[PDB]
Structures are given as structure tokens and as C-alpha cells.
Amino acid sequence: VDLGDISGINASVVNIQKEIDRLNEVAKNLNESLIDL
Amino acid sequence: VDLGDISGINASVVNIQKEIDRLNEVAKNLNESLIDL
Amino acid sequence: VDLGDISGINASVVNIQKEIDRLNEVAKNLNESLIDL
Amino acid sequence: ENQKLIANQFNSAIGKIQDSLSFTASALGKLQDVVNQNAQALNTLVKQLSSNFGAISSVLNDILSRLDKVE
Amino acid sequence: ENQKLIANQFNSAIGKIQDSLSFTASALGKLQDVVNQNAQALNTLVKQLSSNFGAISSVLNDILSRLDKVE
Amino acid sequence: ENQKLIANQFNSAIGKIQDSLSFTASALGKLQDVVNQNAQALNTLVKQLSSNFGAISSVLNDILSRLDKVE
């Protein structure tokens, strides 16, 4: 008896930490674009 | 014979409904920021 | 012996390619909203 | 004249940003729905697998008992 | 002078918002790719598990038949 | 006067867009955390299932050996 192998079934991980950090950086930098007449 | 236990393997659920609701609220509120000279 | 059936356990797929394409289209179209006095 | 241009460009940009926010909200909603469905699927699979492995364990224990009783 | 300031600040803000939209699109694309890969992985696991449980069921049924034929 | 209106509307819009960007970043962070946790869960399940199927294979092979030795 030889059961099927399932060791190859892998689940990738996402790494969008660069994008989240850049979004927060832009949300902070948009204060430098406010208009002060 | 004692097979391994797998009951602890749980899958979390995401709850970003607050953020989606806030995004739609902002997309609706940006009409109050339009310029009418 | 009749083991339980698990064939119905299915995993949906997401199709947000329309939204990503529209976001990139808007990021490109915002150049047409720049102010050139 | 330049004020009309600034106002028109700003209104156009705000409309495009509103569209972008709506599309981001839609994409996040779809991703949430699919991630939650896959989580429910994994949990259902884990529960069914626990039941199936309990059943296999019981059957195998009975088989071992019978093999002991025979030999 | 104030018009030049308004135009410059608006162009800067629109550039930053363009960057933010590009990064949001990239993040949503990565999340889509990973969610779809994990969905394909769960479906492949379910299919292989169905095959394996069918095999175990057949073998266990044969074993029960042999145990009946012996005792 | 119109310049003050343009500046005020622009500052309001930039504040709302900052809020939207913060909420998008928070949503993407939550989605990342949950997708990564579910990926770790699927990998843990695959590893445990491999171990369990190896165990079942060994036990079933021993059972087949005993059935051969008996009959």
C-alpha cells in the first residue's frame, strides 16, 4: 500500500509590507502638500 | 495506534468591514470638498 | 467502513483584476488633472 | 481664468480619486469575501479530517484487536 | 504668487496620490496572487486527500473482508 | 476670497485622502496578517497530514504483513 504524496502542496505567503509602509509614508507626507496662503 | 491531532489547526478570519465602510464614506464625502467658485 | 466525504470543500478564487487595472488607469489619468498655469 | 482652471482640475482630480477609492473598497471587499470563504473551507476541512481520522483510528484499533485475537 | 503656490501644492499632492494608487494596485495584485495560489493549494490538497481516503477505504474494506474470511 | 476657498477645499480633500490612505494601509495590513496566518495553517495541516498518512501507511503495511503471515 502506497498512499499519495502531498508534501509538495505549499501555500505561498504575501509580503506587501513595503506597500503598506509606503502608503503610510505618503499619508504622512501629504501634510507637506497642504496650502498655507 | 494513535494518529496525530490536527484540531488545533485553525484559520483566522479578516474583518476589514470598518475600513471598507470608511473608504466608501470618504468617497462620498469628497463631494463636500469640490470647489464651486 | 465508509469514510466521510470532503469533495465538496472548495476554495473560491478572487478576481479583482478589473479593480487593479482601473486603479492603474486612474494613476495614469491623474496626469491629465495636473495644473499648468 | 486661472482660478477656473485650478477649480476644474481639482474637481477632475477629486472625481478620479473618488472612483479610485470606490474601486479600492470593492477590491478589498472581494478580497475579504474570498479570504473568509477560504478560511471557512480550511476550517471545514480540518473538522472533517478530524472526524475521518478518528474513524480510521477506531477501525484500525479494531483491526489490531482482531489480529491479536487471531494470533 | 498664491496661484503658483496652489498649483505647485496640488501637483505635489497629485503626484503623491498617483504613487499611493500605484502602490495600492501593487499590493492588491500581490494579495490576489497569493490568495489564488493558496486557493489552488487548498483545492489540490482536497483532491489528493479524496484520492488518499478512497485508497484507505478500499484497503480497509479488503482488510475487513480478509478478517471475516479468516474468522 | 476664491483663493481661500480653493485652499480650504484642497486642505479638506487632502485630509480626507490621508484618512483614506491610512485606512487602506490598515486594511491591507489586516489582509496580509490573515492571509499569512491561513498560509501557515495550510502548511501546518499539510505537514501533520503527511505525518499521519505515513503512520497510517506503516500500520496498514504491518496489517497486510500479518494477514499474509496468517493466510
Numbering used by the authors:
A (entry chain D), B (entry chain F), C (entry chain E): 1164 to 1200
D (entry chain C), E (entry chain B), F (entry chain A): 918 to 988
Reported in the publication:
In each case, the process of viral membrane fusion is mediated by the trimeric viral spike glycoprotein (S) that is cleaved into S1 and S2 subunits by multiple host proteases upon infection. Two heptad repeat regions, HR1 and HR2, distant from each other in the prefusion S, drive membrane fusion by assembly into a six-helix bundle. This HR1HR2 bundle formation is thought to provide the energy for membrane fusion and is therefore a target for therapeutics, as exemplified by peptide inhibitors that disrupt infection by the HIV-1 (19, 20), SARS-CoV, MERS-CoV, SARS-CoV-2 (23–25), human parainfluenza virus 3 (26), and respiratory syncytial virus. We therefore designed a scaffold to efficiently determine structures of the postfusion HR1HR2 bundle and its mutants to near-atomic resolution by single-particle cryo-EM.
